[PDB]
Amino acid sequence: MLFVALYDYEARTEDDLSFHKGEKFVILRSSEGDWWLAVSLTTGEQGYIPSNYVAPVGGGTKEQRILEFVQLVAKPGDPQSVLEAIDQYCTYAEWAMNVGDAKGQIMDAVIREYSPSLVLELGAYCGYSAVRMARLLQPGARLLTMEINPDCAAITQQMLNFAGLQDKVTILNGASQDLIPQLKKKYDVDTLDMVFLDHWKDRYLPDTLLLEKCGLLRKGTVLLADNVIVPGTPDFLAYVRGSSSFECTHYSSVDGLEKAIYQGP
Numbered sequence: 001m002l003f004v005a006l007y008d009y010e011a012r013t014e015d016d017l018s019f020h021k022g023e024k025f026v027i028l029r030s031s032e033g034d035w036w037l038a039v040s041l042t043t044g045e046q047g048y049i050p051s052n053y054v055a056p057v058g059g060g061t062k063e064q065r066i067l068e069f070v071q072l073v074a075k076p077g078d079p080q081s082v083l084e085a086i087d088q089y090c091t092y093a094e095w096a097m098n099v100g101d102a103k104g105q106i107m108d109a110v111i112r113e114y115s116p117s118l119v120l121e122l123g124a125y126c127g128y129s130a131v132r133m134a135r136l137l138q139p140g141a142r143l144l145t146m147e148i149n150p151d152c153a154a155i156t157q158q159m160l161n162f163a164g165l166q167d168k169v170t171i172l173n174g175a176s177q178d179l180i181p182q183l184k185k186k187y188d189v190d191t192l193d194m195v196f197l198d199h200w201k202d203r204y205l206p207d208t209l210l211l212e213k214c215g216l217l218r219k220g221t222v223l224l225a226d227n228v229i230v231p232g233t234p235d236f237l238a239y240v241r242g243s244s245s246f247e248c249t250h251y252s253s254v255d256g257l258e259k260a261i262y263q264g265p
């Protein structure tokens with residue numbers, strides 16, 4: 001991750017940045033047996049540094065490494081910055097299953113169009129989408145995310161702490177089918193304005209039917225489902241588009257999001 005410059009270096013080529021010895025860099029990936037792609041801590045610029053000038057300092061899983069990149073590169077308490085850091089690392093360093101910047105354009109439009117006062121995310125992972133949505137909630141508005149994996153939950157918590165969004169989000173530890181019935185009970189929710197679906201692709205139908213059967217859906221509650229089409233959510237995308245209880249709308253960027261506005265029982 002963290003490297004230091006051993007020698008001063010003026011930029012030659014078209015793709016490299018300049019630096020003084022002692023400047024730190026956080027490394028995105030190598031290229032040849034030389035060249036790294038990196039971010040200057042001094043200027044936040046991304047570019048190529050030659051391996052002859054640079055060496056590792058001492059800064060396990062992909063998930064701590066995304067979190068570590070954010071804490072080195074992004075401005076804390078600035079959600080836009082954190083999103084750009086995760087985007088940057090997951091573009092050039094390591095693929096990760098966050099909804100990207102692309103599908104995140106869609107969510108921004110849906111979140112903005114429908115001003116939810118209360119959102120349920122199913123699948124936090126590294127906290128990318130939680131930040132993406134919570135940065136757009138009106139003051140007072142709440143986000144609730146559900147994450148099985150306690151490991152993914154621990155990272156999501158730090159990622160929110162870093163973004164400054166911890167105060168308007170609440171991670172819930174467990175599987176969906178465990179937690180969804182607990183919702184009105186244990187976390188005083190009446191109905192849900194919006195639900196985001198990016199957890200395991202098969203559970204998109206139990207949980208939908210469960211939430212319905214739990215009353216948490218109201219007329220007008222918006223269901224947004226990631227990874228229809230790619231991976232593939234085939235019985236969800238059939239249940240919902242043929243049920244009179246949902247008006248569906250499809251969006252691309254070819255993967256896509258399905259908007260499913262609940263029209264009632």
Ligand SMILES: Nc1ncnc2c1ncn2[C@@H]1O[C@H](CSCC[C@H](N)C(=O)O)[C@@H](O)[C@H]1O
Nearest residue numbers: 098099123125128129148175176198199200
């Ligand atoms: N049934 C379930 N209940 C709660 N969390 C689940 C779940 N099935 C899968 N998950 C979690 O959902 C995550 C899916 S990856 C989702 C990425 C995230 N929505 C983003 O865009 O940034 C994984 O971390 C997995 O642990």
Ligand SMILES: [K+]
Nearest residue numbers: 097098227231
């Ligand atoms: K995916």
